[PDB]
Design a protein around this ligand. Sequence first.
Ligand SMILES: O=S(=O)(O)c1cccc2cccc(Nc3ccccc3)c12
Ligand SMILES: O=S(=O)(O)c1cccc2cccc(Nc3ccccc3)c12
Ligand SMILES: O=S(=O)(O)c1cccc2cccc(Nc3ccccc3)c12
Length: 298
Amino acid sequence: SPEFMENFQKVEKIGEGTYGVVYKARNKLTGEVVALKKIRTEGVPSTAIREISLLKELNHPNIVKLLDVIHTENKLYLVFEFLHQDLKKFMDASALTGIPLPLIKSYLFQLLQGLAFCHSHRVLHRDLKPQNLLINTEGAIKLADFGLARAFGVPVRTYTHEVVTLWYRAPEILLGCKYYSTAVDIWSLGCIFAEMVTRRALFPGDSEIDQLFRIFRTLGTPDEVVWPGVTSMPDYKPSFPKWARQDFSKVVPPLDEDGRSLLSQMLHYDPNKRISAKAALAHPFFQDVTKPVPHLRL
Ligand SMILES: O=S(=O)(O)c1cccc2cccc(Nc3ccccc3)c12
Ligand SMILES: O=S(=O)(O)c1cccc2cccc(Nc3ccccc3)c12
Ligand SMILES: O=S(=O)(O)c1cccc2cccc(Nc3ccccc3)c12
């Protein structure tokens, strides 16, 4: 202390965070491997600093641990605990068989615990996706690559106007809701739940309107009965096609009534009816939840 970038030997690139590249590095002084995320861009809004401070305050088993923050010439290096496996990579490695239900249950349960914690502390993730959910050898899964309400740094990814971060975006956001809620995270997680089960992304759209239509084609085009206020949302258009809701026996074939009940509550159109992370933890689907260790080729 202080830690200096020169104190770290870079080992290998681990991944591509939305706001910075992440490298596996070794602390030359302690031998401890860590994960370093470099963030590169002037001003930083007061609201920005406050949200970052709130996130930094969080200490939870299911949120990747930030160990230090090193400042150096317009650069910022976030020193995190080292992890190098994520749900996306894991699901792909397990594509020709799928993740075992016990592990699906465990991961979903843990993500809900992490989210419940964030939400009670006024913190939202806003950009949940398989790629940013890190897993370790002992079976934990952790939230990472948090999104941002107000910018200040630099977005290093590309997915933006592409075909990825949109796949998990809540409909209220796509329809132009200015003030959204913690419900947007539950929606993303519900999409991830379906994905772990079917082994395919639930709504892989390529544009905001395409994302909306894919959602509509599956859950039915929402109306005032199902979602009070929907027809007055900023970007709602009466010209939207009207699709009927599909049965979950078709949408997520492998799930039973308990799984379907939980998924339906996580994908409820109305944010005011969508299950909270806290309430989801008490859902019967998690009665037999355990903490299985994943089989990784590490
Ligand atoms: O609050 S810090 O712990 O530094 C921090 C931690 C993690 C991410 C950050 C992103 C942008 C600005 C920061 N703050 C900042 C403040 C002053 C100068 C330069 C950057 C961030
Ligand atoms: O960038 S984040 O995910 O926010 C991240 C945050 C904190 C620690 C990380 C450690 C290794 C890899 C990451 N990223 C990563 C990138 C691409 C794929 C999988 C993981 C880490
Ligand atoms: O990297 S993340 O995995 O999101 C992350 C994970 C855990 C704690 C964090 C604390 C402050 C900032 C982060 N990220 C961040 C980076 C750049 C801009 C704004 C926030 C934190």
